[PDB]
Amino acid sequence: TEFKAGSAKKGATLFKTRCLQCHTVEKGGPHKVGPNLHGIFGRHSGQAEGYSYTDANIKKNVLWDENNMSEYLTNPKKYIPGTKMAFGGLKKEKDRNDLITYLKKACE
Amino acid sequence: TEFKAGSAKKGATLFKTRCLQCHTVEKGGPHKVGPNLHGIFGRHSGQAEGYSYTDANIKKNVLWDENNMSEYLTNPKKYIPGTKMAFGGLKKEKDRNDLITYLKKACE
Amino acid sequence: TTPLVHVASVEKGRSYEDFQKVYNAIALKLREDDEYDNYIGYGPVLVRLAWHISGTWDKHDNTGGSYGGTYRFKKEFNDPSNAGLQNGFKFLEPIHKEFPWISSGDLFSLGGVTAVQEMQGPKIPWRCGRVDTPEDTTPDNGRLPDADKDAGYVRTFFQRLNMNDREVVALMGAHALGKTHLKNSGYEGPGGAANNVFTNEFYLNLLNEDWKLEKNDANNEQWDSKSGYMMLPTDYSLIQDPKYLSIVKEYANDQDKFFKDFSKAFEKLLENGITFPKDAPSPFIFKTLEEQGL
Amino acid sequence: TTPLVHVASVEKGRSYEDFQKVYNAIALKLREDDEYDNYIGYGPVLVRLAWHISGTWDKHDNTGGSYGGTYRFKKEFNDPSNAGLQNGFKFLEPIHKEFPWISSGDLFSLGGVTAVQEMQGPKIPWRCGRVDTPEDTTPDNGRLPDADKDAGYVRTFFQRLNMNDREVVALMGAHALGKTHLKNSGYEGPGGAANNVFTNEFYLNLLNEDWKLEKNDANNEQWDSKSGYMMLPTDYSLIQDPKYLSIVKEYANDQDKFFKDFSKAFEKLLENGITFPKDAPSPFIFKTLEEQGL
Ligand code: HEC
Ligand code: HEC
Ligand code: HEC
Ligand code: HEC
Structure with missing residues (x-):
């Protein structure tokens, strides 16, 4: 893809620091602030069962893939107005490459 | 020390890319477009024999501080207006971290 | 004889655009070194640093505050309760070498303002004119x-x-x-x-x-x-x-x-102990890196 | 009836500061991904990109140029002459995603403009108004x-x-x-x-x-x-x-x-084939990152 692949070992380092506090990637894992990310790729925005999202995540309605995910992580509040997630955003391309690569395998 | 050390291997790969074309770190090595840098630390600006520095380089006349010489690589225009060295500059601390470390040992 | 008076005197020939660049230098370095404290960033420690130097102010004798920018000396940066703020100090030093004209006080306070805005906080008006004072004006321990x-x-x-x-x-x-x-x-x-x-x-x-x-x-x-x-x-x-x-x-x-x-x-905290002249320019509102396209 | 006429139409409600922000995004990514091609950067491939798409112009029938501009669709992307320019397109697309309002032609040329200046080259006046064009008008291969x-x-x-x-x-x-x-x-x-x-x-x-x-x-x-x-x-x-x-x-x-x-x-090159109305704004001269303290 136009969005390359990086180290999944470095991506986990990014996920443990910048993600794990709000999310969990294991199958049947617990939600915390944000919805569980297992099987997020190839899924709809905000369809995770049992938890309350904002009106934004539905009325955007994008299939999560390696491209728009990268677009969503650079400026979370630019891509989807009204989103709950409070995140500085990943401003470095390699950081997005590594993290999504880790997310690629972890949410399988 | 006011400036922390970095890796000598990554600085080598950065030296053989952004430097080696213009520069040699060997003792008694030939100048190319730029002067030979052997014994750069513990020596002031532009005393290397055989190379022609524009007077601007012979002007400032400062010992290369760790700590200065690394601030050189920030913007090789500002520090000494009118220099002949054409370089984009190192805008990342991790770059000068690895480079100035490699530029120590190989300068023996 | 009254408590001492601190009048804000703008750095020579310096205006809004000059302080917007200092902002950008700090706002870039935040995005640049993002690995600090397990990817928390230097943002919070810079907000505390602005608070710590402004939290030395005593309204009774007008001692302390961000005016003097005297946070650099053995007396006040070696205390027990400022531990960890040296990281914020080392952060602003390469930036101050870039703008040697700016006062320590204006640099520290701006560093707090910059951090809050870039962290997607509210816009915080910021005024200049803080003047560096000799080491004899350094406050004592335990005012925090x-x-x-x-x-x-x-x-x-x-x-x-x-x-x-x-x-x-x-x-x-x-x-x-x-x-x-x-x-x-x-x-x-x-x-x-x-x-x-x-x-x-x-x-x-x-x-x-x-x-x-x-x-x-x-x-x-x-x-x-x-x-x-x-x-x-x-x-x-x-x-x-x-x-x-x-x-x-x-x-x-x-x-x-x-x-x-x-x-x-927060502005009031940063501006505590400063007497602003009538001819002083209105408070600066700085543009975030997000509004500049970055 | 005569060669075609390409009229520059400014993107709706867009001004200089908007394009300055697009400039910054490109210039920052020039700053950021520096590892490309053994630390040469994306600079040379971006200015060759703006050249290659502007070099498709034919003054005789007014075909090609940066108005389209002639890059953006499939067949001529694969020319024997443009091999290596795919890295230029990959560079500019994430920038086009956060600036979908700007046209592909204006983006390609601005990439060339931005790359030159950030490489410490001369100031290049750049003018907007390039408008997207259907695949049926899509200049062939061997025009370069x-x-x-x-x-x-x-x-x-x-x-x-x-x-x-x-x-x-x-x-x-x-x-x-x-x-x-x-x-x-x-x-x-x-x-x-x-x-x-x-x-x-x-x-x-x-x-x-x-x-x-x-x-x-x-x-x-x-x-x-x-x-x-x-x-x-x-x-x-x-x-x-x-x-x-x-x-x-x-x-x-x-x-x-x-x-x-x-x-x-270079300004003439990217502007070849463009007819600018008299109401069109004066050519923009963008500021470098270095000028903005960035
Ligand atoms: C890493 C990318 C680089 C480092 C580290 C240094 N350079 Fe160069 N160099 C070049 C020229 C033409 C000069 C002459 C300077 C002048 O006349 O003002 C220099 C000089 C230096 C110096 C200072 C030497 C002195 O006596 O003042 C240092 C510390 C130095 N260089 C380190 C040539 C080039 C060049 C050509 C395109 C490049 C890419 C670099 N230098 C890069 C580096
Ligand atoms: C704290 C709060 C965070 C942090 C630091 C991150 N996320 Fe996660 N996230 C959070 C919330 C409250 C929501 C719901 C927002 C809404 O309903 O609109 C989300 C949402 C996501 C999504 C969308 C998918 C889904 O709705 O299930 C993704 C893809 C996502 N978050 C990923 C993600 C990544 C990769 C993060 C770190 C790099 C990250 N978030 C941080 C809560 C929070
Ligand atoms: C306007 C801002 C502000 C005010 C006022 C403030 N703090 Fe904090 N303080 C911070 C921030 C931000 C941090 C986190 C800094 C970091 O993580 O590097 C912090 C951290 C701390 C820490 C822990 C630092 C460490 O590294 O463990 C202590 C202790 C502390 N503050 C004490 C206080 C006390 C006591 C008060 C008032 C009674 C106070 N501060 C008021 C912003 C503030
Ligand atoms: C104003 C800009 C400009 C003009 C005009 C121009 N070029 Fe170049 N071209 C470039 C740049 C810059 C590169 C380097 C690309 C790189 O290093 O990625 C390049 C690369 C090339 C390459 C090699 C590409 C590769 O990846 O190996 C060829 C071949 C080439 N140009 C042909 C030509 C010819 C033939 C002409 C004119 C007779 C021409 N160009 C005019 C800017 C230009």
């Missing part, structure tokens, strides 16, 4: 608050900063940022799930979470929750005092109200 | 020059671009940037020591360095130097042409002259 204390000590301390209940509760919203480092202050853990983003989570977590008083590995006592968060005693006292509680409850519902109150209270 | 050729071929080719002797020598100065990749064009090596900074080294090395005609690993003959430099036959033909030789030695002694001549020439 103790973390193990109650609501009474908090209200009492902030009176010396001329801060009322409204302003102090707003200012405490900043403790949603960063964390406590056991190696530094003797407390451990963050206050919420967003450390590097400016939000009202502080007030939300305070009354929403279930808090238990426990002991850390420094033997100090802090309020911990099942979610892994923490609260200092001085922080937990805000829901203990009924007057503090209503304002806590309000900011939890209205984040916009919290932003506007914080901005005024 | 061949590197193995002589001076006469170059003069003849650039007549189609409305370029004269002085204008082509100025444009050729951009070949001091980056290198040739054997994998791509069948040629290998740089033209000088400084690849990622804009300079007159192209002209200096041209008449100073000792050149040898040598076969590369692609069995293509190029002019190689002892310092490890190289020149395309088309580049070397500039000192093979006496009238070209005069302009080459001029830019060698005077860099400022070349910087000003390139500015007009």
Whole structure:
């Protein structure tokens, strides 16, 4: 893809620091602030069962893939107005490459 | 020390890319477009024999501080207006971290 | 003979655009070194650094504050309760070498303003004119608050900063940022799930979470929750005092109200002890890196 | 009925500051991804990109140019001449995603403009209004020059671009940037020591360095130097042409002259085929990151 692949070992380092506090990637894992990310790729925005999202995540309605995910992580509040997630955003391309690569395998 | 050390291997790969074309770190090595840098630390600006520095380089006349010489690589225009060295500059601390470390040992 | 007077004198030939560049230098370095403190960033420690130097102010004799920018000397950066702020200091030093003209006071205070804005916080008006003073003007130890204390000590301390209940509760919203480092202050853990983003989570977590008083590995006592968060005693006292509680409850519902109150209270904190001339320019409102396209 | 007319229509409600923000995004990514092509950067490939899409123009029927601009769809992306320019497109698409309002043609040319300035080149006035165009008008392959050729071929080719002797020598100065990749064009090596900074080294090395005609690993003959430099036959033909030789030695002694001549020439290039209405705003001169403290 136009969005390359990086180290999944470095991506986990990014996920443990910048993600794990709000999310969990294991199958049947617990939600915390944000919805569980297992099987997020190839899924709809905000369809995770049992938890309350904002009106934004539905009325955007994008299939999560390696491209728009990268677009969503650079400026979370630019891509989807009204989103709950409070995140500085990943401003470095390699950081997005590594993290999504880790997310690629972890949410399988 | 006011400036922390970095890796000598990554600085080598950065030296053989952004430097080696213009520069040699060997003792008694030939100048190319730029002067030979052997014994750069513990020596002031532009005393290397055989190379022609524009007077601007012979002007400032400062010992290369760790700590200065690394601030050189920030913007090789500002520090000494009118220099002949054409370089984009190192805008990342991790770059000068690895480079100035490699530029120590190989300068023996 | 009156308490000493600190008049704000703008740096020679310096204007808005010059200070906007200093902002950009700090705002870039924040994005640049993002690995600090497990990817929290230098943002929170720069907000505390601006608070720490401005928290030395005494309204009675007009001693201390951000004016002198005397935070650089052995007396005041080696204290017990400033531990960890050296990182914020080393952060602004390469930037000050870039702009040797700017005063230490204006640099530190701006560094606090910059951090808050880039963390997606409210716009904070910032004024220049702070003047560096000789080392004889350096204040003494213990003019900053103790973390193990109650609501009474908090209200009492902030009176010396001329801060009322409204302003102090707003200012405490900043403790949603960063964390406590056991190696530094003797407390451990963050206050919420967003450390590097400016939000009202502080007030939300305070009354929403279930808090238990426990002991850390420094033997100090802090309020911990099942979610892994923490609260200092001085922080937990805000829901203990009924007057503090209503304002806590309000900011939890209205984040916009919290932003506007914080901005005024934070600016006032940074501007405490400064006498601004009539010919002084209006307060600068700096553009975020997000508004400049970055 | 006559050649086509391409009218520049400014994107709805867009001004200079909007395009300045797009400039910044590109310029920051120039700053950020520096590891490309052994730390040369995306600079040379972006200015070649803006050239290659503007080099498709034919003054006779007014086909091609940056109005479309001729890049953005499938077939001609695959030309034998444009191999390696896919990295330029990959660079600009994430920027186009956060700026979907700007047209592809205005983005490609601005990429070329931004790359030159951030490489410490001259200020290049850039004008918006380029409008997206359907795939049915999509100029073919072989409308761009061949590197193995002589001076006469170059003069003849650039007549189609409305370029004269002085204008082509100025444009050729951009070949001091980056290198040739054997994998791509069948040629290998740089033209000088400084690849990622804009300079007159192209002209200096041209008449100073000792050149040898040598076969590369692609069995293509190029002019190689002892310092490890190289020149395309088309580049070397500039000192093979006496009238070209005069302009080459001029830019060698005077860099400022070349910087000003390139500015007009390069601005003319991306603007070829565009008819600007009289109400159209004056050409933008964007500020570099360095000017903004970035
Ligand atoms: C890493 C990318 C680089 C490092 C580290 C240094 N350079 Fe260069 N160099 C070049 C020239 C033409 C000069 C002359 C300077 C002048 O006349 O003002 C220099 C000089 C230096 C110096 C200072 C030496 C002195 O006596 O003042 C240092 C410390 C140095 N260089 C380190 C040539 C080039 C060049 C050509 C394109 C490049 C890419 C670099 N240098 C890069 C580096
Ligand atoms: C704290 C709060 C965070 C942090 C630091 C991150 N996320 Fe996660 N996130 C959070 C919330 C409250 C929501 C719901 C927002 C809404 O409903 O609109 C989300 C949502 C996401 C999504 C969308 C998918 C989904 O709705 O299930 C993704 C893809 C996502 N978050 C990923 C993600 C990544 C990769 C993070 C770190 C790099 C990250 N978030 C941080 C809560 C929070
Ligand atoms: C307007 C801002 C602000 C005010 C006012 C403020 N703080 Fe904080 N403080 C912060 C921020 C932000 C941090 C986190 C810094 C970091 O993580 O590097 C912090 C951290 C701390 C820490 C832990 C530092 C460490 O590294 O462990 C202590 C202790 C502390 N503050 C004490 C206090 C006390 C006591 C008060 C008032 C009674 C107070 N501060 C008022 C912003 C503030
Ligand atoms: C104003 C800009 C400009 C003009 C005009 C121009 N070029 Fe170049 N071209 C470039 C730059 C810069 C590169 C280096 C690309 C890189 O290093 O990624 C390049 C690269 C090339 C390459 C090698 C590409 C590769 O990846 O190996 C060829 C071949 C080439 N150009 C042909 C030509 C010919 C033939 C002409 C004219 C007769 C010409 N170009 C005119 C800017 C220009």
